[PDB]
Amino acid sequence: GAMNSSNYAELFNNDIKLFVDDTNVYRVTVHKTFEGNVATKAINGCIFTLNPKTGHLFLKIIHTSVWAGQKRLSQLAKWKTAEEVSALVRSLPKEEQPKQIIVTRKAMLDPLEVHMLDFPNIAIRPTELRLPFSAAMSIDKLSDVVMKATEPQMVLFNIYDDWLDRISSYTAFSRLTLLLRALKTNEESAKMILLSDPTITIKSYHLWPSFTDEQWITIESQMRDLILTEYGRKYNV
Amino acid sequence: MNTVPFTSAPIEVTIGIDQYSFNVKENQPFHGIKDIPIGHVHVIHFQHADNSSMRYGYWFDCRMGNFYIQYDPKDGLYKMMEERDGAKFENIVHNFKERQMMVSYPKIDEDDTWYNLTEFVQMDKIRKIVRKDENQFSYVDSSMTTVQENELSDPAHSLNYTVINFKSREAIRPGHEMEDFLDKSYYLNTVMLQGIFKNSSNYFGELQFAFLNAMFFGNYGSSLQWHAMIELICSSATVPKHMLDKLDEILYYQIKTLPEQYSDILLNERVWNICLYSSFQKNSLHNTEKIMENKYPELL
Numbered sequence: 422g423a424m425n426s427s428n429y430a431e432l433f434n435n436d437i438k439l440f441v442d443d444t445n446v447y448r449v450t451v452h453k454t455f456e457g458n459v460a461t462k463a464i465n466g467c468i469f470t471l472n473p474k475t476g477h478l479f480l481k482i483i484h485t486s487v488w489a490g491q492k493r494l495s496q497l498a499k500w501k502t503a504e505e506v507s508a509l510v511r512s513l514p515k516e517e518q519p520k521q522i523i524v525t526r527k528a529m530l531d532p533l534e535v536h537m538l539d540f541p542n543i544a545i546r547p548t549e550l551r552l553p554f555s556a557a558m559s560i561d562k563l564s565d566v567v568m569k570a571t572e573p574q575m576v577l578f579n580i581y582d583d584w585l586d587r588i589s590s591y592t593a594f595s596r597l598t599l600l601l602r603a604l605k606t607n608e609e610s611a612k613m614i615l616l617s618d619p620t621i622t623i624k625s626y627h628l629w630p631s632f633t634d635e636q637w638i639t640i641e642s643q644m645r646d647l648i649l650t651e652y653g654r655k656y657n658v
Numbered sequence: 659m660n661t662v663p664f665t666s667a668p669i670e671v672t673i674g675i676d677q678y679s680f681n682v683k684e685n686q687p688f689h690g691i692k693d694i695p696i697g698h699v700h701v702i703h704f705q706h707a708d709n710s711s712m713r714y715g716y717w718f719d720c721r722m723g724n725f726y727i728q729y730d731p732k733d734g735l736y737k738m739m740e741e742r743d744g745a746k747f748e749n750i751v752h753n754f755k756e757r758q759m760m761v762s763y764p765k766i767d768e769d770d771t772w773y774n775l776t777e778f779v780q781m782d783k784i785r786k787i788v789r790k791d792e793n794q795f796s797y798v799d800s801s802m803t804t805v806q807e808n809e810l811s812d813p814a815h816s817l818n819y820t821v822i823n824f825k826s827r828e829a830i831r832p833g834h835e836m837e838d839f840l841d842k843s844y845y846l847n848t849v850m851l852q853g854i855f856k857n858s859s860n861y862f863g864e865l866q867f868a869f870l871n872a873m874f875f876g877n878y879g880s881s882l883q884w885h886a887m888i889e890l891i892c893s894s895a896t897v898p899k900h901m902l903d904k905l906d907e908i909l910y911y912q913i914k915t916l917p918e919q920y921s922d923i924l925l926n927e928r929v930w931n932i933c934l935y936s937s938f939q940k941n942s943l944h945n946t947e948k949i950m951e952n953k954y955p956e957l958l
């Protein structure tokens with residue numbers, strides 16, 4: 422059934438699974454028209470499909486052209502997401518296809534289930550976790566590739582960089598969710614923390630800076646301060 | 659006018675014949691029901707006074723044979739049987755009538771209720787869902803499960819209702835996933851009406867048949883089927899105008915006849931609220947919506 426705090430280590434066992442987040446698939450700016458009405462303009466989006474054990478990220482870029490002449494876009498976005506995830510699965514060798522797909526929003530369950538009818542043995546699961554994957558577009562390199570795309574495009578990343586050489590998947594996922602939670606609660610502060618020290622750089626083939634083990638502990642501590650803070654600044658405590 | 663005689667009534671029992679029901683006391687001199695209208699299917703059904711568990715009964719059509727009821731003390735129930743000796747049967751019936759040991763099927767002349775509930779229900783068609791080919795009548799009870807229930811265990815005792823499943827390859831054309839899930843017209847009109855049922859008459863009859871088994875026997879799988887067939891129509895943007903008009907009449911009389919005190923279990927809030935207020939056909943069921951709002955405004 423649903424994925425929650427109780428069954429959390431299942432993410433890091435040896436059954437292939439993907440998280441799918443559709444938050445950033447349909448993205449708009451809202452603006453005024455010459456007549457003083459309101460209109461939306463779409464910008465490029467992305468599906469965030471992530472293997473939490475390996476860090477492999479299948480970033481399907483959603484170009485604004487896919488919405489042209491369509492109605493009820495928020496609803497279409499869920500079905501387009503399910504179509505693209507189903508296409509991804511079919512593109513993978515049988516031994517790489519997931520055994521479970523966990524959707525971060527419950528409204529993806531039926532669209533994905535219908536698109537995956539050919540795969541009755543792939544479990545489609547919700548989650549009770551409030552995961553911060555919407556903040557993926559706060560990672561500069563991911564945002565850049567989405568905004569520059571001129572056509573539909575899939576781009577493959579490892580969202581853990583090389584961390585798995587030194588830490589376990591569980592620890593890597595915990596670091597990722599903390600970084601993304603921070604970027605979601607206060608993007609400017611989060612990014613300041615990550616870059617304050619000009620001597621620590623982001624490798625061309627990485628997303629995050631090349632912190633030593635010690636510096637990660639400092640960084641992680643600064644991100645938890647930020648999150649508790651903003652939680653004060655927000656609630657006054 | 660036809661007759662279903664009873665050999666005897668050895669155990670106290672409430673007997674239903676269609677929408678009517680009366681009480682028979684243990685060893686009361688009761689020998690059957692007469693004046694049963696010809697031209698309709700009928701159901702005769704039983705609830706024992708000592709064990710309200712298991713309502714059970716028999717669908718039949720007097721045009722297809724001479725039928726009677728006889729209690730079996732080994733299996734502990736009233737059984738329907740066919741008498742093949744026509745002279746013997748007329749004799750039995752005439753003697754019981756002369757002794758006025760039969761109750762009078764109380765049809766009021768103004769009253770079209772039973773016709774309206776069974777307009778597309780036929781004994782030969784009923785046999786395709788309740789399989790027991792050696793008899794002309796069909797047994798149903800509270801506990802019997804449907805073929806679809808058996809998929810999610812004795813197949814000879816199953817209701818082979820047509821299986822409907824909105825998240826199934828049969829319902830969803832490859833490449834039309836969103837279209838077909840949100841507008842079920844192709845599943846209704848091509849898959850079900852043109853391919854399986856053959857026409858609207860067969861679709862309506864199974865739907866009427868499902869309701870009556872839910873109402874008279876509390877058969878949960880039949881209730882699921884009735885709501886499933888209804889939802890499939892209401893969730894189709896493209897339905898023949900004649901079907902919608904007839905559906906509104908069918909459901910009106912079904913809601914009209916439902917015991918007020920059983921609405922809690924026999925009516926699915928989600929289906930009805932979706933059908934009457936959200937679906938494509940939200941404006942096409944005027945009589946049904948009016949009776950639902952005046953009789954069960956709580957469910958909504």
Ligand SMILES: CC(C)NC[C@H](O)c1ccc(F)cc1
Binds near residue numbers: 779784787861862
């Ligand atoms: C069997 C095939 C699907 N058409 C017939 C339909 O099932 C049906 C119709 C009327 C009934 F009283 C019972 C069942």
